[PDB]
Amino acid sequence: GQTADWKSIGLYILSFALPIILKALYMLSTRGRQTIKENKGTRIRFKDDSSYEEVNGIRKPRHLYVSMPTAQSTMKADEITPGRFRTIACGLFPAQVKARNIISPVMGVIGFSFFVKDWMERIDDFLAARCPFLPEQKDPRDAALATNRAYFITRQLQVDESKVSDIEDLIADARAESATIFADIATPHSVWVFACAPDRCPPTALYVAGMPELGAFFAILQDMRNTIMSAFYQSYLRRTQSMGIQLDQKIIILYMSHWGREAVNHFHL
CB 186 within 8 A of CB 123: yes
In whole angstroms, give the CA distance from residue 78 to residue 66.
Answer: 11
Under DSSP, the state recorded for 143 is: G
Nearest Cα to Cα of residue 195 among 63, 101, 123: 101
Nearest Cα to Cα of residue 264 among 212, 214, 224, 223: 224
In whole angstroms, give the CA distance from residue 155 to residue 138.
Answer: 23
In whole angstroms, give the CA distance from residue 48 to residue 127.
Answer: 42
Under DSSP, the state recorded for 190 is: G
In whole angstroms, give the CA distance from residue 22 to residue 228.
Answer: 32
**b or e along 26-53 (b: 16 or more beta carbons within 10 Å of the residue's beta carbon)?**
bbbbbebeebeeeeeeeebebebeebee
What lies within 8 Å, CB to CB, of 77 at 6+ separation is: 3, 4, 5, 8
In whole angstroms, give the CA distance from residue 58 to residue 173.
Answer: 28
CB 24 within 8 A of CB 36: no
Strand partners, 46: 64
